[PDB]
Design a protein around this ligand. Structure first.
Ligand SMILES: CC(C)CCC[C@@H](C)[C@H]1CC[C@H]2[C@@H]3CC=C4C[C@@H](OC(=O)CCC(=O)O)CC[C@]4(C)[C@H]3CC[C@]12C
Ligand SMILES: CC(C)CCC[C@@H](C)[C@H]1CC[C@H]2[C@@H]3CC=C4C[C@@H](OC(=O)CCC(=O)O)CC[C@]4(C)[C@H]3CC[C@]12C
Ligand SMILES: CC(C)CCC[C@@H](C)[C@H]1CC[C@H]2[C@@H]3CC=C4C[C@@H](OC(=O)CCC(=O)O)CC[C@]4(C)[C@H]3CC[C@]12C
Ligand SMILES: CC(C)CCC[C@@H](C)[C@H]1CC[C@H]2[C@@H]3CC=C4C[C@@H](OC(=O)CCC(=O)O)CC[C@]4(C)[C@H]3CC[C@]12C
Ligand SMILES: CC(C)CCC[C@@H](C)[C@H]1CC[C@H]2[C@@H]3CC=C4C[C@@H](OC(=O)CCC(=O)O)CC[C@]4(C)[C@H]3CC[C@]12C
Ligand SMILES: FC(F)(F)c1ccccc1-c1cc(C(F)(F)F)c2[nH]c(C3=NOC4(CCCCC4)C3)nc2c1
Ligand SMILES: FC(F)(F)c1ccccc1-c1cc(C(F)(F)F)c2[nH]c(C3=NOC4(CCCCC4)C3)nc2c1
Ligand SMILES: CCCCCCCCCP(=O)(C(C)C)C(C)C
Ligand SMILES: CC(=O)N[C@@H]1[C@@H](O)[C@H](O)[C@@H](CO)O[C@H]1O
Ligand SMILES: CC(=O)N[C@@H]1[C@@H](O)[C@H](O)[C@@H](CO)O[C@H]1O
Lengths: 155, 201, 103
């Protein structure tokens, strides 16, 4: 199976050579060549996106859950979910108290996100009036403004 | 004009020759010994003087400060997400020391300037971040109570957002991202019109 | 699409032996990924099983390969970055480039 995976990655690499070999078409060639000039805009886009993802993910994780102690889920909650937010998915169903519980584990035994902190009464302790505006601003900045800016720079 | 830009570049690189490539100097920064080698070319002019020139250049100081700031952000995140308890542990005390250093530098910058200091957005944001960090410290030391600790944690998270957003400002001297970052100020009125129509609808 | 689909199918499942489902998994799902759907719910080990068939009797996708223990055998740390890069390139960059060229 290790060899099969190696072969699959090698197949990706082999397939990507078609783009290089089809640079002499006289219709696709110039456009393929032009892609090299557009990397700096992509770099700026990724820079802003990464900064915003780091900030939003760290803030949300700190405000919802305490002492995860698991690296895989730390990175899944901090990086992966905000990244998916760029494609239209609301970053968290946990940002709203209504849509919570039954998908959490108080102990890290299970492969589930850590449960949110609770108060003296058994009800969630985070404030929606902080989280919801946060997610609103993040989605507005990422999904709409940044992509349109990238379009303009490409043009 | 090109002459003033060349003068500023020469000051920015200091002793190091401006013809040297950035990746070479960064690599020599990460591994000290290579500065004693000839990888980095010094235009202006004994290894001791080589090292002094290398570490007196504002370029290298800026890169070192950027590394330190990134490490500070990493430590902040680790404390906030993984090692936040009723009684602060060693990493949080180290974080407090680093923030104290930042605060002392901020006070120096305060004293150099007057009230014109607060006429810039980023300086105001820095002051707000330091004040919110102090407020979080104040809230977090009531270890008996279980709500002051969480209030301090939330304060720290918002302050972390504010701290992280400063990277955009500090990376405005890259010569590749800088112009585009500057250009964002010109596009606010279109956003305002968009939001106006959206809100009405 | 060809590259991503072949890689994902090879990394998740072995020896489908069904042409219709081969083309459905290799071509159709990556194509839908252009319209905002994440290419695979199977890219993450958490969201798997109960929608698979070990034998090709049923009209369901073939189940992922399993190890000596009855747990999935693929590595998430390879699949997830793959899907992230693919979605970034397709949904965002390519469409904006098309907009620019049309303009
Ligand atoms: C179907 C899977 C499981 C196996 C992989 C087969 C691919 C190698 C086939 C499938 C789709 C085909 C492609 C569909 C579109 C094009 C573009 C085409 O480019 C041109 O003809 C340019 C002509 C011009 O510029 O005028 C060349 C073939 C290619 C790559 C086709 C040839 C080979 C491809 C990639
Ligand atoms: C300026 C732009 C970028 C943001 C505008 C988006 C709006 C849709 C945001 C801005 C302020 C937000 C509101 C601020 C506070 C609240 C109360 C909140 O209700 C609660 O959860 C209260 C909890 C409790 O009572 O304990 C519901 C969302 C709402 C209207 C937020 C929902 C979304 C709002 C209107
Ligand atoms: C300590 C660990 C956890 C950080 C390792 C992550 C690296 C990717 C960071 C750390 C130091 C950073 C570098 C410090 C200084 C610079 C120079 C900077 O280029 C300029 O500022 C040029 C200025 C000019 O041309 O005038 C680009 C980023 C770089 C390589 C920074 C980019 C990213 C680096 C390598
Ligand atoms: C991972 C989380 C939980 C902790 C936060 C760590 C961040 C401070 C790291 C993670 C991703 C890193 C960034 C990925 C991309 C860039 C852009 C980069 O900008 C340049 O190097 C410009 C170079 C040029 O212009 O030529 C500087 C580092 C930065 C912010 C990296 C350095 C620090 C970041 C934000
Ligand atoms: C440079 C651009 C185009 C890609 C940046 C997108 C990120 C969101 C990707 C890049 C690297 C990816 C990470 C690489 C490795 C892992 C571990 C993975 O955890 C596991 O599944 C481990 C499995 C095990 O322990 O057995 C979760 C995703 C994560 C953080 C991946 C999730 C998404 C990341 C951060
Ligand atoms: F294209 C673009 F860049 F969007 C943009 C285009 C046109 C005009 C303004 C902007 C812009 C610029 C910046 C800045 F350059 F100043 F950073 C923005 N920052 C933010 C946010 N800040 O923090 C958030 C992420 C972290 C959590 C809180 C919310 C989003 N939205 C911005 C919009
Ligand atoms: F508009 C665009 F073209 F996106 C683009 C616009 C501006 C700058 C760069 C690009 C670009 C170019 C190429 C290249 F021309 F070099 F191919 C890209 N290739 C890939 C990927 N490679 O493999 C993936 C598919 C197969 C599975 C692994 C991931 C995506 N993303 C690219 C982005
Ligand atoms: C809320 C913003 C906090 C700013 C606190 C002041 C830090 C200054 C950042 P720096 O001076 C570096 C010494 C960390 C930057 C110019 C590299
Ligand atoms: C020391 C420890 O981890 N105990 C937990 C226990 O509280 C939990 O009920 C069980 C099921 O998740 O897994 C284990
Ligand atoms: C030779 C063969 O195909 N056997 C399968 C059998 O394993 C399976 O239990 C049944 C229900 O799917 O369909 C058939």
């Amino acid at each position: 199976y290790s060899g099969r995976v190696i072969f699959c990655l090698d197949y990706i690499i082999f397939t990507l050579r078609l783009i290089h070999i089809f640079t002499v078409s006289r219709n696709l060639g110039p456009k393929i060549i032009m892609l090299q000039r557009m990397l700096i805009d992509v770099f700026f886009f990724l820079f802003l996106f990464a900064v915003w993802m780091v900030a939003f993910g760290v803030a949300r994780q700190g405000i919802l859950r305490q002492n995860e102690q698991r690296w895989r889920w730390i990175f899944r909650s901090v990086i992966y979910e905000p990244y998916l937010a760029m494609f239209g998915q609301v970053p968290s169903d946990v940002d709203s108290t209504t849509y919570d519980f039954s998908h959490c584990t108080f102990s890290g035994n299970e492969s589930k996100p850590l449960c949110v902190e609770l108060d003296e009464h058994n009800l969630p302790r985070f404030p929606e009036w902080i989280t919801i505006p946060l997610v609103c601003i993040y989605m507005l900045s990422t999904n709409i403004l940044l992509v349109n800016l990238l379009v303009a720079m490409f043009g | 004009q090109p002459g003033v830009q060349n003068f500023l570049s020469k000051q920015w690189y200091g002793e190091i020759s401006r013809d040297t490539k950035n990746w070479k100097i960064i690599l020599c920064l990460f591994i000290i010994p290579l500065v004693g080698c000839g990888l980095v070319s010094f235009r202006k002019k004994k290894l001791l003087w080589y090292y002094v020139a290398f570490f007196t250049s504002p370029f290298v100081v800026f890169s070192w400060n950027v590394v330190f700031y990134i490490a500070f952000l990493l430590l902040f995140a680790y404390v906030l997400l993984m090692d936040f308890h009723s009684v602060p542990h060693t990493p949080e005390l180290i974080l407090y020391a680093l923030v104290f250093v930042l605060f002392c530098d901020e006070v120096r910058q305060w004293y150099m300037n007057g009230v014109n200091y607060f006429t810039d957005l980023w300086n105001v944001m820095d002051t707000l971040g330091l004040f919110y960090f102090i407020a979080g410290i104040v809230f977090r030391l009531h270890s008996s109570n279980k709500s002051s600790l969480y209030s301090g944690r939330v304060i720290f998270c918002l302050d972390y957002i504010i701290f992280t957003l400063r990277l955009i400002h500090i990376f405005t001297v890259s010569r590749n991202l800088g112009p585009k970052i500057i250009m964002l100020q010109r596009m606010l009125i279109d956003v305002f019109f968009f939001l106006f129509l959206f809100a009405v609808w």
